[PDB]
Coordinates of C-alpha atoms and ligand atoms in Angstrom, one line a residue:
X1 CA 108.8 108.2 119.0
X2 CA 107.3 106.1 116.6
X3 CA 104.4 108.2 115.4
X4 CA 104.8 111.9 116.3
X5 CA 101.4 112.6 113.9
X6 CA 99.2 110.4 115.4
X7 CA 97.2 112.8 117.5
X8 CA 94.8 110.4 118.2
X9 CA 92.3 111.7 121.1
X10 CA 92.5 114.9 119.1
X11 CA 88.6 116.8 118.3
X12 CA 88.2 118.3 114.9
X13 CA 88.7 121.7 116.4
X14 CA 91.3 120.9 118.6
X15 CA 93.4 119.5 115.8
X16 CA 93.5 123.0 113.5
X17 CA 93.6 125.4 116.0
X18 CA 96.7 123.3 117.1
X19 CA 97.9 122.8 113.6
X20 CA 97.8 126.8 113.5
X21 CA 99.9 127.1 116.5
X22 CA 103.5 128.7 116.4
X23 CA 106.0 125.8 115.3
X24 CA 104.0 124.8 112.2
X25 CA 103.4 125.4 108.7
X26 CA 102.9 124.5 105.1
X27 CA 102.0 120.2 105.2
X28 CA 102.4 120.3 109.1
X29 CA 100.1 117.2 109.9
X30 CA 98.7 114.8 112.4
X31 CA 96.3 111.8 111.7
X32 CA 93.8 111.6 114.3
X33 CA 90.8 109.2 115.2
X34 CA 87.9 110.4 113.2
X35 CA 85.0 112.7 114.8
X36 CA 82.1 112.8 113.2
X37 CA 81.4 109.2 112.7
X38 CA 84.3 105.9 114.6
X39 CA 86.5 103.7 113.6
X40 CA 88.2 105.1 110.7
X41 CA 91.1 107.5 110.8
X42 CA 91.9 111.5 109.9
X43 CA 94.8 113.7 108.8
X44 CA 94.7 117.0 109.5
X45 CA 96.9 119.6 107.4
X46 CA 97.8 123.1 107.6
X47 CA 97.9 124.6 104.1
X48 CA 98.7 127.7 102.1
X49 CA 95.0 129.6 100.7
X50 CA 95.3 132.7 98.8
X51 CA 92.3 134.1 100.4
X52 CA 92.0 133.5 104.3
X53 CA 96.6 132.0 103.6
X54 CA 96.8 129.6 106.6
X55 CA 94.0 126.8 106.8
X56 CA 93.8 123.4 107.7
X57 CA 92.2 121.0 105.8
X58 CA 91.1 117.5 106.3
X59 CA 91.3 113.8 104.3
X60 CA 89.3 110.9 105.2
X61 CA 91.8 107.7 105.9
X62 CA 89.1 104.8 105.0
X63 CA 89.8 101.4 106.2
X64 CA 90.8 99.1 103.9
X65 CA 89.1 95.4 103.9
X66 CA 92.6 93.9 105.3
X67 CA 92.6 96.0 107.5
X68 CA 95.1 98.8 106.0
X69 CA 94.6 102.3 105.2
X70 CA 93.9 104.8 102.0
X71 CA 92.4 108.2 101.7
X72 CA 92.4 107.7 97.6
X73 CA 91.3 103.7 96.1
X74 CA 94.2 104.2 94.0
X75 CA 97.1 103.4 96.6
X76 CA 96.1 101.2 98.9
X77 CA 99.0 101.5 102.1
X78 CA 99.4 98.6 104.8
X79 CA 100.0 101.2 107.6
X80 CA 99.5 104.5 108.6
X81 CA 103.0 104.9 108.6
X82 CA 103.7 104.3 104.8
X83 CA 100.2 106.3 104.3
X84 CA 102.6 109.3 105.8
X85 CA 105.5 108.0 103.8
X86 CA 104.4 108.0 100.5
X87 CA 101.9 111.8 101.1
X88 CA 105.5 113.5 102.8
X89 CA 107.4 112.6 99.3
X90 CA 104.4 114.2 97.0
X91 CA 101.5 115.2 97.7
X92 CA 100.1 112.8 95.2
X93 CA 96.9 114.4 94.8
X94 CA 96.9 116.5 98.3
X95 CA 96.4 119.7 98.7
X96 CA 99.7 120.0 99.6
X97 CA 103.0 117.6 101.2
X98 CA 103.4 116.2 104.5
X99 CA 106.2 118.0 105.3
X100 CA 106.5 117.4 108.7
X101 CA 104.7 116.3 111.8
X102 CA 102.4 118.6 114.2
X103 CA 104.3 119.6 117.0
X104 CA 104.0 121.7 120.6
Ligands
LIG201 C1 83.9 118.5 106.4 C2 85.3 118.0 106.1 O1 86.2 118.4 106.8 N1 85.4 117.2 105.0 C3 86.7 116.7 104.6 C4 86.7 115.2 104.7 C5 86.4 115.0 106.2 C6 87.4 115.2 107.1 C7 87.1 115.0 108.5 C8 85.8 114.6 108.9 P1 85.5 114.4 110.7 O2 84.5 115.3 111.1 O3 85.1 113.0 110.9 O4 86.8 114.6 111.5 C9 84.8 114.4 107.9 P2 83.1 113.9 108.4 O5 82.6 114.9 109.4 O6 82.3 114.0 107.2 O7 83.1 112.6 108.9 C10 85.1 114.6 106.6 C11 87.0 117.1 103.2 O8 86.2 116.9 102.3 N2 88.2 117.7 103.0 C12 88.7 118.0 101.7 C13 90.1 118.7 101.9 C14 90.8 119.2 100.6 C15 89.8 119.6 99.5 C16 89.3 118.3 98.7 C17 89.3 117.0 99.4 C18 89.6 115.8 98.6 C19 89.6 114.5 99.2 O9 89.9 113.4 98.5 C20 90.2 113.4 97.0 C21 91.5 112.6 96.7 C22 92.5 113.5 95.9 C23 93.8 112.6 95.5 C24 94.5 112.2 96.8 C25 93.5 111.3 97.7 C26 92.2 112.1 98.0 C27 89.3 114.4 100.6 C28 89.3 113.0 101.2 N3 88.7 112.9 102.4 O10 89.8 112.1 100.7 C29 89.0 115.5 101.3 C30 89.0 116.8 100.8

């Protein structure tokens, strides 16, 4: 299974209250098709808060020109694949690390 993240037809909503479902935790992701506005891309993580603990947070994947992906200008990745790659090995500015994929 090529992309066990990609939670595509996944609502805002949907996507936490799933994220804080039994099976997850700390950089337990999925990447789904944006909400509020189309065409560009979200990833949806469940992270550690002092205050309320469990939360899950959101980061804007913007389109790149090409046609690749980004949620910072700085690295610029060719899929969403190595986008996933390169956040699950540091967080590289996150919140926190994709640890592992969103599951049920
Ligand atoms: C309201 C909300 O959830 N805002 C999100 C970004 C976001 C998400 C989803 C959606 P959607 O409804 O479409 O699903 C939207 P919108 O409505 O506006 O279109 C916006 C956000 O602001 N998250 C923080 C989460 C952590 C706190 C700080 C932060 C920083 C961010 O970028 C900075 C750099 C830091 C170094 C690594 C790369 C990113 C981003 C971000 N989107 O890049 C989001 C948030």
């Amino acid at each position: 299974e090529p992309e066990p993240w990609f939670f595509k037809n996944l609502s805002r909503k949907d996507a936490e209250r799933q994220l804080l479902a039994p099976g997850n935790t700390h950089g337990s992701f999925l990447i789904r098709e944006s909400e509020s506005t189309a065409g560009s891309f979200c990833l949806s993580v469940r992270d550690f808060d002092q205050n309320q603990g469990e939360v899950v947070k959101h980061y804007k994947i913007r389109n790149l020109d090409n046609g690749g992906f980004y949620i910072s200008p700085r690295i610029t990745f060719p899929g969403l694949h190595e986008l996933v790659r390169h956040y699950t090995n540091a967080s590289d500015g996150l919140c926190t690390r994709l640890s592992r994929p969103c599951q049920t």
